[PDB]
């Protein structure tokens, strides 16, 4: 949710943010919460294996 808030603010700020430095910081907040949101979603379960393993499947 917080990642979407920053990302949407980044899109609006293209036209309405006064300072380039301020827009850069908003975009930095977008990227920061994107990684944290991705980690939080991903770490809850194990990583699934590949479905295609040629050197094993050929046996």
């Amino acid at each position: 949710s917080l990642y979407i808030v920053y990302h949407l603010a980044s899109m609006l700020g293209i036209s309405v943010t006064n300072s380039d430095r301020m827009l850069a910081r908003i975009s930095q907040g977008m990227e920061m919460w994107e990684s944290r949101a991705l980690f939080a979603d991903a770490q809850s379960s194990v990583t699934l294996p590949f479905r295609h393993n040629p050197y094993v499947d050929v046996r």
Binding site: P54, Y55, V56, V58, R59
Partner: protein, 61 residues
């Protein structure tokens, strides 16, 4: 009895019998090197090797 132990028949796929005999032996001798219990056909060392061969051939391809 021993002299009649092996019953031998030659016929066609439409069940037309061409020859019937009874002898003390039959033409065939069957070889096995090793055998898994419950199976009549054997399993030899080249059968043990083929999964390894399959991996090698895939690697070379």
């Amino acid at each position: 009895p021993e002299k009649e132990r092996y019953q031998y028949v030659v016929m066609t796929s439409s069940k037309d019998v061409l020859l019937e005999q009874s002898n003390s032996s039959w033409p065939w001798v069957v070889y096995r090197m090793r055998r898994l219990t419950g199976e009549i056909r054997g399993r030899g060392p080249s059968l043990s090797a083929y999964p390894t061969a399959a991996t090698i051939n895939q690697a070379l391809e």
